[PDB]
């Protein structure tokens, strides 16, 4: 069940082709995770790839609006 990486070699976690957000950092891209059960180690994903329809004459303008209230501890 071995799996060699760039940070060492991970004994006891299967390599998955998928890529979800980083759960347990490992090193050099890899990020472990526990999902149904077993522990998986993959290459973390930076986020949902989202192009934008940019033209030279198209725009986007909001109509509604949310008033969010975030919290910042210091």
């Amino acid at each position: 069940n071995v799996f060699q990486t760039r940070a060492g070699c991970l004994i006891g976690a299967e390599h998955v082709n998928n890529s979800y957000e980083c759960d347990i950092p490992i090193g050099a891209g890899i990020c472990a995770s526990y999902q149904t059960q077993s522990i998986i180690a993959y290459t973390m994903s930076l986020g949902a790839e989202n192009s934008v329809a940019y033209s030279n004459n198209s725009i986007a303008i909001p109509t509604n609006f949310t008033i969010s209230v975030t919290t910042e501890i210091l």
């Binding site: 930076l46 989202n50 033209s55």
Partner: protein
Amino acid sequence: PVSMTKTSVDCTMYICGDSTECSNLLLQYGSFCTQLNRALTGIAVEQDKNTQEVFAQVKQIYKTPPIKDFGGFNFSQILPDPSKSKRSFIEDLLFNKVTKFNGLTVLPPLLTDEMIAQYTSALLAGTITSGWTFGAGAALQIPFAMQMAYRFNGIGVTQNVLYENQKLIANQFNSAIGKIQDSLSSTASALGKLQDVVNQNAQALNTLVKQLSSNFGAISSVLNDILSRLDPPEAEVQIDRLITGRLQSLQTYVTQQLIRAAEIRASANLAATKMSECVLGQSKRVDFCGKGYHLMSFPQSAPHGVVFLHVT
């Protein structure tokens, strides 16, 4: 500069490497070397937190449309090259202008260089196609000419100025980008700020390794030559001298690292603030975002750091 080298040092295998006698004797000094290991692990984690704070600011991963209709702005030098580590031209120039077994492991960074370059390319494409709305909320497309009209309206200059001088503006822009290319490729003394972080870490490590081969007042700077020559009673005095010396050296190095990492974290907080208030927006803070009235910025990654292009 944004991050340091995630160095880790093993107290035991450094001080009394491969000696149960010296290990046991060091054990009488208490939690000293556990303290040291915990400090260096704190530094090693803080480096990844620094890089995260600086770059990982965009929610999604934007990607420019291939139809490059940018009113004349070329942008090809900073957008990724799909034919390489998919980095941009100026990211590459920034790369190539920057240049042992004692428990001195060197952990790897958590965000590889290609993931860093993907992050800054996301930020760059979002900026290009959507101004600041992608940092203010959901990205809203808008033609680059109209975006630069907004920016011009920010510094107290009516839009018609741009809308009339668009061609001259695009020419000046692209010429300045080319000048940046030439400068970075010719006078490689521009990356001193990163190269000196690297040199300072290398010299700290070299001093730390040299200190291994000094007597500190003992008879032989080789623990094994002391062990294989003397009795436990006298060897204990000699080994005690060596342990005292090496531990003082290791503590000095770790304190230097703590101070330098505090400095680097100050610089990474400053880079995070700079990206948030400069790229993702347009700051009216004079001389904070380029000498002059500010228009936008474009981040470009670099080895252990970030590089902006303050378009003023």
